[PDB]
Design a protein around this ligand. Sequence first.
Ligand SMILES: *[C@@H]1O[C@H](CO[C@@H]2O[C@@H](C)[C@@H](O)[C@@H](O)[C@@H]2O)[C@@H](O[C@@H]2O[C@H](CO)[C@@H](O[C@@H]3O[C@H](CO[C@H]4O[C@H](CO)[C@@H](O)[C@H](O)[C@@H]4O[C@@H]4O[C@H](CO)[C@@H](O)[C@H](O)[C@H]4NC(C)=O)[C@@H](O)[C@H](O[C@H]4O[C@H](CO)[C@@H](O)[C@H](O)[C@@H]4O)[C@@H]3O)[C@H](O)[C@H]2NC(C)=O)[C@H](O)[C@H]1NC(C)=O
Ligand SMILES: *[C@@H]1O[C@H](CO)[C@@H](O[C@@H]2O[C@H](CO)[C@@H](O[C@@H]3O[C@H](CO[C@H]4O[C@H](CO)[C@@H](O)[C@H](O)[C@@H]4O[C@@H]4O[C@H](CO)[C@@H](O)[C@H](O)[C@H]4NC(C)=O)[C@@H](O)[C@H](O)[C@@H]3O)[C@H](O)[C@H]2NC(C)=O)[C@H](O)[C@H]1NC(C)=O
Ligand SMILES: *[C@@H]1O[C@H](CO)[C@@H](O[C@@H]2O[C@H](CO)[C@@H](O[C@@H]3O[C@H](CO)[C@@H](O)[C@H](O[C@H]4O[C@H](CO)[C@@H](O)[C@H](O)[C@@H]4O)[C@@H]3O)[C@H](O)[C@H]2NC(C)=O)[C@H](O)[C@H]1NC(C)=O
Ligand SMILES: *[C@@H]1O[C@H](CO)[C@@H](O[C@@H]2O[C@H](CO)[C@@H](O[C@@H]3O[C@H](CO)[C@@H](O)[C@H](O)[C@@H]3O)[C@H](O)[C@H]2NC(C)=O)[C@H](O)[C@H]1NC(C)=O
Ligand SMILES: *[C@@H]1O[C@H](CO)[C@@H](O[C@@H]2O[C@H](CO)[C@@H](O[C@@H]3O[C@H](CO)[C@@H](O)[C@H](O)[C@@H]3O)[C@H](O)[C@H]2NC(C)=O)[C@H](O)[C@H]1NC(C)=O
Ligand SMILES: *[C@@H]1O[C@H](CO)[C@@H](O[C@@H]2O[C@H](CO)[C@@H](O[C@@H]3O[C@H](CO)[C@@H](O)[C@H](O)[C@@H]3O)[C@H](O)[C@H]2NC(C)=O)[C@H](O)[C@H]1NC(C)=O
Ligand SMILES: *[C@@H]1O[C@H](CO)[C@@H](O[C@@H]2O[C@H](CO)[C@@H](O)[C@H](O)[C@H]2NC(C)=O)[C@H](O)[C@H]1NC(C)=O
Ligand code: NAG
Ligand code: ZN
Length: 608
Amino acid sequence: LDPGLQPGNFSADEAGAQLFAQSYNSSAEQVLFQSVAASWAHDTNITAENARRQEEAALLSQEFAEAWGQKAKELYEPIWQNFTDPQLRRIIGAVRTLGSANLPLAKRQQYNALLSNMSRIYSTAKVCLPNKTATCWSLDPDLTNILASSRSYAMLLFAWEGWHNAAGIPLKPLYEDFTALSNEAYKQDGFTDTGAYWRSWYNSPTFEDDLEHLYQQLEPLYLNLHAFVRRALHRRYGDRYINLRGPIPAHLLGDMWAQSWENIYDMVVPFPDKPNLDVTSTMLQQGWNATHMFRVAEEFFTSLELSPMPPEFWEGSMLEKPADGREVVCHASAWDFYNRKDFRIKQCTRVTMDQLSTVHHEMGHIQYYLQYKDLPVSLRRGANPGFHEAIGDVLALSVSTPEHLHKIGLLDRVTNDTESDINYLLKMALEKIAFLPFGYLVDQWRWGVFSGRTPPSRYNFDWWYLRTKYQGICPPVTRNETHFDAGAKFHVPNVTPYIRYFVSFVLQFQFHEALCKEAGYEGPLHQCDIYRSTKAGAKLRKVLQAGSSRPWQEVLKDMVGLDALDAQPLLKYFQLVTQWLQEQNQQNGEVLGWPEYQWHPPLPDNYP
Ligand SMILES: *[C@@H]1O[C@H](CO[C@@H]2O[C@@H](C)[C@@H](O)[C@@H](O)[C@@H]2O)[C@@H](O[C@@H]2O[C@H](CO)[C@@H](O[C@@H]3O[C@H](CO[C@H]4O[C@H](CO)[C@@H](O)[C@H](O)[C@@H]4O[C@@H]4O[C@H](CO)[C@@H](O)[C@H](O)[C@H]4NC(C)=O)[C@@H](O)[C@H](O[C@H]4O[C@H](CO)[C@@H](O)[C@H](O)[C@@H]4O)[C@@H]3O)[C@H](O)[C@H]2NC(C)=O)[C@H](O)[C@H]1NC(C)=O
Ligand SMILES: *[C@@H]1O[C@H](CO)[C@@H](O[C@@H]2O[C@H](CO)[C@@H](O[C@@H]3O[C@H](CO[C@H]4O[C@H](CO)[C@@H](O)[C@H](O)[C@@H]4O[C@@H]4O[C@H](CO)[C@@H](O)[C@H](O)[C@H]4NC(C)=O)[C@@H](O)[C@H](O)[C@@H]3O)[C@H](O)[C@H]2NC(C)=O)[C@H](O)[C@H]1NC(C)=O
Ligand SMILES: *[C@@H]1O[C@H](CO)[C@@H](O[C@@H]2O[C@H](CO)[C@@H](O[C@@H]3O[C@H](CO)[C@@H](O)[C@H](O[C@H]4O[C@H](CO)[C@@H](O)[C@H](O)[C@@H]4O)[C@@H]3O)[C@H](O)[C@H]2NC(C)=O)[C@H](O)[C@H]1NC(C)=O
Ligand SMILES: *[C@@H]1O[C@H](CO)[C@@H](O[C@@H]2O[C@H](CO)[C@@H](O[C@@H]3O[C@H](CO)[C@@H](O)[C@H](O)[C@@H]3O)[C@H](O)[C@H]2NC(C)=O)[C@H](O)[C@H]1NC(C)=O
Ligand SMILES: *[C@@H]1O[C@H](CO)[C@@H](O[C@@H]2O[C@H](CO)[C@@H](O[C@@H]3O[C@H](CO)[C@@H](O)[C@H](O)[C@@H]3O)[C@H](O)[C@H]2NC(C)=O)[C@H](O)[C@H]1NC(C)=O
Ligand SMILES: *[C@@H]1O[C@H](CO)[C@@H](O[C@@H]2O[C@H](CO)[C@@H](O[C@@H]3O[C@H](CO)[C@@H](O)[C@H](O)[C@@H]3O)[C@H](O)[C@H]2NC(C)=O)[C@H](O)[C@H]1NC(C)=O
Ligand SMILES: *[C@@H]1O[C@H](CO)[C@@H](O[C@@H]2O[C@H](CO)[C@@H](O)[C@H](O)[C@H]2NC(C)=O)[C@H](O)[C@H]1NC(C)=O
Ligand SMILES: *[C@@H]1O[C@H](CO)[C@@H](O)[C@H](O)[C@H]1NC(C)=O
Ligand SMILES: [Zn+2]
């Protein structure tokens, strides 16, 4: 520990704690920058040297969070709740959280080693065909691509069976040990369990109830969608393997976790005679290039009179693919270095209509970072953890439209045909609405484990209960408590909350509606754009400047006017497809929901 990074002495006063907050701030951006710089380099190009620098940076960060966290508890754990500023209470409350650093070394060294071991066995999971094969598969590319692409039911089944079997089972013992150790650490931090810690972020005493009220508002839309898809699969696979009343076999939905079904959009799409618009042909013809695209993205924000990207951003960012042959993580990401001056993007840009949209949300994050850089570092995070991605997405929504592309000049004429825009809303529904029930059930399920209400003998039972209850899916081959299908997801062994994403996808439209309402727009909400609309920016800026200083429920209210989440705006956005599906279901006599829930298909005749 460098002494300039090691805390000093502070009194039990607020007057002291204000000085503690100030000292933590000044040290914090000096450590976090050094940490993120290393992590930036390692990700900007892989080298074992940079991986080492990445590893050392990780340790240096934790060592810093520890050295300060321990004193924050020692001096202010008896007090912090008392302090007059809600901003300061947030500052100290964050520092005062220690997480795993509560565990004594013996447990601590098991804990880290245990968490790493889960990620290893998941990331390095494998499935092998039932021969003396030279070669096995892995989740990507082999499994993701066969599962999405092929539709011979047996082959599709085996791929799903192998994965949840191989990925889950060897996790089963580890995940229990994680659960015990996880809760024990937070107990000392001040939470009943890890689950009550995660819910602490949303600072809402009624949080879990709020979700069910939201989800109940979605269920008519989701059931409408689910019931529609279910019929389509019946056309494809046969009466033996689908029940037009029952739930859907989990592996037919084109995705290993059935969390988003878009790979059956090719099978289901409405109005097969219409195209789906691709503006790439203009963009290449215009001589658009990656470097230019961001200037369009910046144009948008400048058009809202949000802040332009500072010169440092253009000096630093890796907008283009590198000139070297060096290996790089191409997946696009946006970075804030807590050093106030320089913000950074990595995009690996390929000039296509899709990545044009993608750049806009990635720059959206940068605009978000730019606005709250003025806060003390402890607060420089989204108003709540799903709130940051929402401000990212509302931007991509607007520009994805044909309407905005015409103001970009990339589109020649607007073509207001509902058959086309239904195609667009429906694919987006198969992407994101299918995700809401899944995103909801996981963190209910994990809260069930962390609260203990799902003891280890029920890990798998409570999972499939939650799947059929919410997502309308059931397992394709009988699954029993030797298995552990909850582990087969990325976010579970990586102990990463999904609930942020669900909160975000609701805040997304709850903003978009409140912006389009403010931008003077009227008409079909998916045809709104806010570009050039200074009225939207000045209100949006008020959200971004707040960062996390001000409780999100108060900030959301200042933007939208509602003290809480609501899915009515989301239903407004999807309204056109909502109507269309209701017609199509009513025409087919399709039974919304899934009675005969106690059904799942027989096995293929010679399996395998
Ligand atoms: C990615 O795309 C970027 C943008 O490309 C341009 O725009 C897009 C939409 C497409 O249409 C592209 O085809 C198009 O090229 C590229 O940056 C641009 O690169 C080109 C070529 O390298 C640049 O063109 C050259 O610019 C010189 C400077 O011209 C400006 O400055 C003069 C003073 O030096 C001034 O007198 C001019 O009026 C001009 O001012 C610009 O005005 C327009 C509006 O009228 C603004 O939009 C600009 O921002 C203004 N820029 C400034 C600095 O004020 C010219 O001297 C030069 O002409 C000479 O060279 C050409 C060959 O290049 C000869 O053919 C010609 O006869 C003459 O001798 C030429 O115009 C362009 O300026 C760059 N953009 C900017 C903003 O500077 C990226 O390089 C590209 N990257 C990749 C990898 O593709
Ligand atoms: C969390 O902790 C950070 C870091 O300690 C605090 O930032 C510092 O806050 C103070 C108060 O706002 C700020 O002082 C003001 O800075 C303005 C710019 O001052 C710069 O120029 C003068 C000369 O004109 C220098 O004397 C200063 O040291 C500054 O120097 C420049 O700083 C930038 C930014 O880091 C750096 O990139 C440049 O390299 C450097 N210049 C050169 C030539 O190298 C003044 O206009 C103003 O009047 C005040 O002096 C101080 O500069 C901040 N430092 C940094 C590193 O950010 C945060 O305030 C704190 N958080 C909160 C919420 O308070
Ligand atoms: C990924 O990005 C990083 C940052 O841009 C980039 O880092 C550089 O990589 C090169 C090798 O490709 C490093 O060069 C050597 O590093 C070794 C130690 O690992 C040194 O022994 C070498 O010393 C000589 O060179 C020095 C100047 O670099 C001289 O001052 C010295 O006297 C010796 O003559 C040499 O430094 C370089 O150090 C790193 N730098 C950093 C900051 O990482 C890396 O190249 C990129 N990846 C790829 C594949 O290009
Ligand atoms: C932060 O506050 C602490 C506690 O008020 C200060 O700690 C004290 O620091 C002095 C030196 O400034 C230490 O002196 C040592 O005392 C022992 C005898 O106990 C002697 O054998 C050593 O040779 C040395 O003189 C003292 O131990 C230490 N005491 C405590 C309780 O921490 C500290 O000075 C303050 N920080 C700063 C930067 O001033
Ligand atoms: C994380 O997983 C790894 C791998 O399962 C665990 O490391 C393994 O630990 C065992 C002993 O605990 C090692 O087996 C022993 O090896 C020695 C020879 O080194 C042998 O004499 C013993 O009879 C026994 O076979 C095993 O080699 C070791 N593997 C690796 C790769 O290190 C680790 O303990 C797990 N940690 C947690 C927290 O789960
Ligand atoms: C939960 O369901 C699984 C199947 O999905 C059951 O596990 C299976 O049980 C049978 C009977 O023991 C195993 O067959 C045996 O395999 C061994 C080779 O491993 C072979 O030598 C025997 O002759 C016999 O064929 C089968 O392999 C096994 N599968 C797995 C993946 O373990 C399990 O019994 C069910 N849970 C409970 C509590 O019964
Ligand atoms: C910190 O907590 C204490 C205890 O809840 C508060 O002290 C009490 O304050 C009320 C009025 O605010 C008095 O009627 C009590 O007599 C006080 N009790 C004691 C033991 O002093 C204190 O006000 C809180 N501080 C803040 C800033 O809210
Ligand atoms: C598209 O045409 C319909 C015609 O009824 C109209 O109601 C709708 O508002 C048009 N789109 C926009 C963005 O105005
Ligand atoms: Zn994002």
